[PDB]
Structures are given as structure tokens and as C-alpha cells.
Amino acid sequence: FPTLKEWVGKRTIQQMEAHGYSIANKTFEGTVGISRDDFEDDNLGIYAPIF
Amino acid sequence: MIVTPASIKALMTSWRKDFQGGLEDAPSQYNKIAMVVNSSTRSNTYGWLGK
Structure with missing residues (x-):
């Protein structure tokens, strides 16, 4: 609000302002691929922890 | 002799799939x-193993 000033004459009608700001969402992705043979021939269990 | 169109007469057949x-x-x-x-x-x- 406008800071108060000395009153001589009649009131000075002032004005203020409003600000705006916008942020847009984004889409992200990440993917990997492994063949069915490699995933099914893994008896060791080394490829299991991918999830 | 019931005169019959050739297209209709052709449908009077049996599927054998032999x-x-x-x-x-x-x-x-x-x-x-x-x-x-x-x-x-x-x-x-x-x-x-060998002999």
C-alpha cells in the first residue's frame, strides 16, 4: 500500500499493482531393454533387480 | 426340370476337407x-572321466 504522506489540499488517488508468474509442467522418461533370451537364461539371478 | 442359375447351383456342394x-x-x-x-x-x- 502507498506509504502515508502529508495531507495538504485534497487526497491524491494513487494506484498499486499485482504480479503474476507461471510454471509449466514437463514430462520425463527413461527406458532400457533386454532380450528375452538373456533374461530367461539368467540362472545366477543377476538381472532381476532392475525394477 | 427346375431351371436354376449357375451361381445357386454351385452352392449345392459338400465340403470334404480330406x-x-x-x-x-x-x-x-x-x-x-x-x-x-x-x-x-x-x-x-x-x-x-577317463578310464
Whole structure:
């Protein structure tokens, strides 16, 4: 609000302002691929922890 | 003699499906020369002892 000033004459009608700001969402992705043979021939269990 | 169109007369036939698989392939003879073994991994390792 406008800071108060000395009153001589009649009131000075002032004005203020409003600000705006916008942020847009984004889409992200990440993917990997492994063949069915490699995933099914893994008896060791080394490829299991991918999830 | 009920005069009949050729298209309608053609529909008066019976499906027989007796020639399916008529021409097969040559008989399998690999069972006289090879032995069937299974696998569950990228390869199969065979080992034996000497006399």
C-alpha cells in the first residue's frame, strides 16, 4: 500500500499493482531393454533387480 | 426340370476337407543317429572321466 504522506489540499488517488508468474509442467522418461533370451537364461539371478 | 442359375447351383456342394496334410515331409531319421538332450541356459557343458 502507498506509504502515508502529508495531507495538504485534497487526497491524491494513487494506484498499486499485482504480479503474476507461471510454471509449466514437463514430462520425463527413461527406458532400457533386454532380450528375452538373456533374461530367461539368467540362472545366477543377476538381472532381476532392475525394477 | 427346375431351371436354376449357375451361381445357386454351385452352392449345392459338400465340403470334404480330406486332402488336408496329404503331402507330408520325408520321415524323420535323426533319432537313429542323435540323442535328444534338454537345456535351460545359454549353453550346455558336458564332462566325463577317463578310464
